[PDB]
Design a protein around this ligand. Structure first.
Ligand SMILES: [Mg+2]
Ligand SMILES: [Mg+2]
Ligand SMILES: [Mg+2]
Ligand SMILES: [Mg+2]
Ligand SMILES: [Mg+2]
Ligand SMILES: [Mg+2]
Lengths: 97, 97
C-alpha cells in the first residue's frame, strides 16, 4: 500500500476512472496490458465471484481454468483484503441468487 | 483481442468502470492485483505520457525507473495500438505543455 501512494499510481487510476464504456476499456487495457495479463485479472475476478456464489473449488477450476493455488490466493484477497470485490458484487448485483 | 471477447473480460471491465473514486480504485485494484503489477501498469502509463511529452529515453528511465526495453515496448503500444493512451491524455488534459 505505502509503495502505491504515488502520483504515478494516482494518474493511472484517473486514467482508468475516465473510461466511459466497454469499448474504451478494451482500447485502453489492451494498450497498457498484455492479453495474458487481462485474462489473468478477469480469471481472478470470476474466481472471486464464484467463491462468493458458494461454488466448490472444482467447479471454479473447471469454469475459469484457474489452478487451485490461484483460487486460494484470490480467496485470501477476497476475505482479508479491502472488500473491493464484495463492494463491486453488491453494487453491480452480480452474484447468482 | 479475439481471446479477450469473453464474458469474464466484460465483467472485469464493468467492475472497473463502476469504480466511483480513487479510494475505490485503490481498494479494488489492490484486491485484484499485486503491488508490483499495479506499479508496473503505472510505470507504463507514465512512460507513455512522458513519450508524448517528447522526453528522451534517458529522462524517462530516470524519472520512471523503466528500463529502455520497457520504454520501447510501451512505445509500440502507444504508436501501433488502439490509441487508448492518447485518448486518455487528450481527455484528461495531461500532457505537460
Ligand atoms: Mg510521488
Ligand atoms: Mg505476457
Ligand atoms: Mg494468479
Ligand atoms: Mg464466454
Ligand atoms: Mg508479484
Ligand atoms: Mg514492462
Amino acid at each position: 500500500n505505502n509503495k502505491l501512494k504515488t502520483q504515478a499510481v494516482e494518474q493511472l487510476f484517473q486514467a482508468i476512472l475516465s473510461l466511459k464504456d466497454l469499448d474504451e476499456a478494451y482500447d485502453f487495457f489492451e494498450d497498457v496490458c498484455t492479453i495474458n495479463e487481462i485474462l489473468s485479472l478477469s480469471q481472478r475476478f470470476e474466481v472471486a465471484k464464484m467463491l462468493r456464489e458458494h461454488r466448490t473449488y472444482l467447479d471454479i477450476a473447471e469454469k475459469t481454468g484457474a489452478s487451485t493455488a490461484t483460487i486460494s490466493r484470490v480467496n485470501r484477497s477476497l476475505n482479508y483484503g479491502n472488500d473491493g470485490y464484495d463492494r463491486v458484487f453488491e453494487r453491480l448485483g452480480m452474484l447468482e441468487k
